[PDB]
């Protein structure tokens, strides 16, 4: 008996959430030993999965496959692989609440998907048991099958690594003693972003969360001080060793100009974004 279920998609936030804890709990009788969730996503979507740790009561023998869930998925539903290798520019976070013993896995699909992919994740509580009313009840397994559609449009921004040429418009392998400034102009509903080596220093801190305001003598300002109609995301160091940041404007009226820098003892790389509400990209 393999059951089936769906992951709720919030249309407003573009967020899919899969609710598995009550499905695999060992304290309640269930008729499916394994439940299958199927979800299809596209570029920039987010997938949120709350899942237990085995400190949580009725999940004492729980485990995840792939075991390194933060970094990996099951390719073709069987073999572990770094999600970066099949979905370059992916961002995952894996947060643990020390008090509730619940964790939250979050996967951001990057702003452009170069190839159609499928992969899965398994949350296996089949070894956990609870004695409830003199019945020994076992936990269950939830498997999430994820399909991601091809990504529509390359990012209009700056790959300073030379390794994401398939993802960004500007892409150049970094050479010593470089003073490169990548100029970008974007209108609404258009992705920008950048990739650097993670050992480069990114200024200001966690760009674009703070940026140099070009229209105010390059003062460091939080992006929220310049706009509140913008979505962004960031990973400081993915499993390949790269930093990426992504940014997109939605119904922003004010013309904005800002920058960020990735610098080392050898080179400087600057991304300068001009956002123009009336700009129409060619």
């Amino acid at each position: 008996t393999i059951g089936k279920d769906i992951c709720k998609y919030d249309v407003t936030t573009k967020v899919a959430t899969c609710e598995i804890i009550d499905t695999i709990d060992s304290s309640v009788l269930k008729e499916h030993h394994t439940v299958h969730y199927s979800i299809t996503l596209s570029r920039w979507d987010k997938l949120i999965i709350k899942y237990p740790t085995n400190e949580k009561t009725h999940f004492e023998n729980f485990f995840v496959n792939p075991f390194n869930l933060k970094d990996k998925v099951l390719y073709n539903y069987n073999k572990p692989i770094n999600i970066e290798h099949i979905l370059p520019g992916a961002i995952t976070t894996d947060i643990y609440d020390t008090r509730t013993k619940i964790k939250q896995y979050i996967l951001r699909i990057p702003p452009y998907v170069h190839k159609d992919i499928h992969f899965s994740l398994e949350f296996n509580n089949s070894l956990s048991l609870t004695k409830q009313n003199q019945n020994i009840i076992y936990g269950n397994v939830a498997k999430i099958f994820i399909h991601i559609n091809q990504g529509y449009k390359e990012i209009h921004g700056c790959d300073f690594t030379g390794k994401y040429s398939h993802l960004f418009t500007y892409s150049k392998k970094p050479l010593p003693n470089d003073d490169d400034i990548c100029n970008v102009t974007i209108g609404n509903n258009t992705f920008s972003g950048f990739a650097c080596l993670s050992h480069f220093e990114l200024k200001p801190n966690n760009c674009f969360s703070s940026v140099y305001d070009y229209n105010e003598a390059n003062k460091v300002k939080k992006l929220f001080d310049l706009s509140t109609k913008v979505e962004l995301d960031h990973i400081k160091q993915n499993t390949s060793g790269y930093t990426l940041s992504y940014i997109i404007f939605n119904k922003e009226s004010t013309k904005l100009k800002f920058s960020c820098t990735c610098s080392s003892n050898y080179s400087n790389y600057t991304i300068r974004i001009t956002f123009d509400p009336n700009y129409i990209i060619p």
Partner: nanobody
Amino acid sequence: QVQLQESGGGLVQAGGSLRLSCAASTFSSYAMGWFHQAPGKEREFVASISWSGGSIRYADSVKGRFTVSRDNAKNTAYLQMNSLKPEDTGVYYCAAGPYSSDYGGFGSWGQGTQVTV
């Protein structure tokens, strides 16, 4: 967190036996795990044991051959390695954390000990 140090690595033949220990210097509220890294591979899950010893999990490939245990009073965990096969060669790490159900639970790591079959 917790300071971990392993010991007990050795060379043996297909069928030989070995016994690693791992010493902590708060151990008794952590799950412990053993991990194996062969050359050119990642640290692969071998075994885990809850803080109480009540919950134990083994990689499917070492079932029946290895036995994890622990001694909370003495802050020591053990891996008993029997029926050693040549694939078992590699570096063995002990690790500790609040949980062991996914790799991110393990916040403290030892330094590894070599096991050659």
